Write a protein that binds this ligand. Sequence first.
Ligand SMILES: O=c1ccn([C@H]2C[C@H](O)[C@@H](COP(=O)(O)O)O2)c(=O)[nH]1
Ligand SMILES: O=c1ccn([C@H]2C[C@H](O)[C@@H](COP(=O)(O)O)O2)c(=O)[nH]1
Lengths: 275, 281
Amino acid sequence: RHDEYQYLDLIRQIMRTGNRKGGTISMFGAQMRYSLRDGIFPLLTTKRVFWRGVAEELLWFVRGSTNAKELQEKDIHIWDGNSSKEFLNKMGFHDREEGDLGPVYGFQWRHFGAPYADMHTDYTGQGVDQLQQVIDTIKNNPDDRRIIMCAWNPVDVPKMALPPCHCLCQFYVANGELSCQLYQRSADMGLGVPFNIASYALLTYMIAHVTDLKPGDFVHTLGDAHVYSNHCEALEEQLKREPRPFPSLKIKRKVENISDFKFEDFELDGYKPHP
Amino acid sequence: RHDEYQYLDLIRQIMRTGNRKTGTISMFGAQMRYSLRDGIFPLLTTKRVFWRGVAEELLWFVRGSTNAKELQEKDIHIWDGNSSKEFLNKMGFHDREEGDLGPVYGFQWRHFGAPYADMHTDYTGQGVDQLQQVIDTIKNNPDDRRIIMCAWNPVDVPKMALPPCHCLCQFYVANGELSCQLYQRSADMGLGVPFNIASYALLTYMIAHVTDLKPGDFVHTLGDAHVYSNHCEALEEQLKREPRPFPSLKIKRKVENISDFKFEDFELDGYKPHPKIKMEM
Ligand SMILES: O=c1ccn([C@H]2C[C@H](O)[C@@H](COP(=O)(O)O)O2)c(=O)[nH]1
Ligand SMILES: O=c1ccn([C@H]2C[C@H](O)[C@@H](COP(=O)(O)O)O2)c(=O)[nH]1
């Protein structure tokens, strides 16, 4: 059975048995598994996913950036509404300049625990570089059961433009394969979840490449999994669609370090989503 | 189907198809759901679980303690091997006194982000009191999707006697019920997982009681779920056992705040487990 049916089945289950809150319909606790083997890339097909946005945002997290203007320069506007000087003033951050998202993902992955000042501050050597730590552990002690990267930082969540949906991820190595599990506290099934699967499947492909392992599975765990009430009609139309075979992903060259990837290094072949 | 079959089915699946890597046999990524409704308490029945240890350890976390001697005074020795002055010296903590586990669960739940000194330091008002925060959010904004308590603190994990297995938990409210999901990075299916289910089911019962809600579900999510190779014979004996109906749990009085619970406040009725099975190191 096509892996995308897990996603469609959960949407069907939520709309048919979920809890209505004043508007969403939700369920609590779900888990999906997507194979990443033999070049398979789980970019959902029953609706087009924003591949360019997935990859550019992930490269921006890997650089440790908290500056939304670096995404805007690449025509990525996912963090726009939360980076305006007007929105930042409404939250309570008065000396915060346009584009400064605060200590969001990039900062937590590269500098967890460092005191945040602004998006231009040199944080070199400050805090825990969890992304490099996971790479070092996968290479040196792959059976380790603490290969974790955490973005949910209770100290910093109030300083962020938005609290992170992707709380932590854990890696696992077996059979020459790298697997990843993501704990996502809040999942908009309609518009958020396909993008989120692609982000963490892509991070797994990147870390596998630089650790000389093959991608295994991406395990997606959800907390509050929900459908917005105004998307139900559109989702009933999407549930009529049969998933198309997933595209393949190849990395075009031997990339040495996780910081060395560029958008052009990815070759996404055969992506044929429904209209 | 009895909820305990989810646990038994995973043990069977791990031994049959798990990855062989002391040797472990493991799978990555699993999820179980245990109903906590109508007074049902998921204290596993295929082996007798240490109920007084589950409860006393949880009350010790709620107090914010990191002192294993407070558990020892109650004849609870679960944190002993990791609190000896010899073990603490091997880890690299030289000025650490006997019983000082470092900034483990109790400290992270009550004082996340505070600088840890020792187990006797007064941390009043320091760091984030995530447990009280969870309670305030459930009472004031129950639809909130950020009702989280995190014990995985990358800054403090190197100072802990042991890195936490229980990384975070999230709460959810619907139809007057409180549910909890635990993300457990590492799960020993033999002796670890039954105790761990009981701890977070009990925490859900306690928070539901103080927030005027009814317990809903406990969702248990696992990362590296495994069995030790030397426990396979014992686990094959456990798999022959049929689960008995779960016991019930009642809270004997109206407890106002999460910090006010005492072990005598719990009434666990009808616990009828099969005997313990030796699973040693
Ligand atoms: O990567 C992301 C970011 C956001 N959301 C959705 C989940 C919720 O619908 C909303 C975030 O709102 P809160 O859970 O923080 O209230 O956006 C996702 O699905 N994925
Ligand atoms: O509450 C706990 C604590 C420990 N363990 C088990 C999991 C592993 O077998 C071991 C911890 O070792 P690491 O995962 O930290 O290596 O103890 C549990 O199952 N539950």
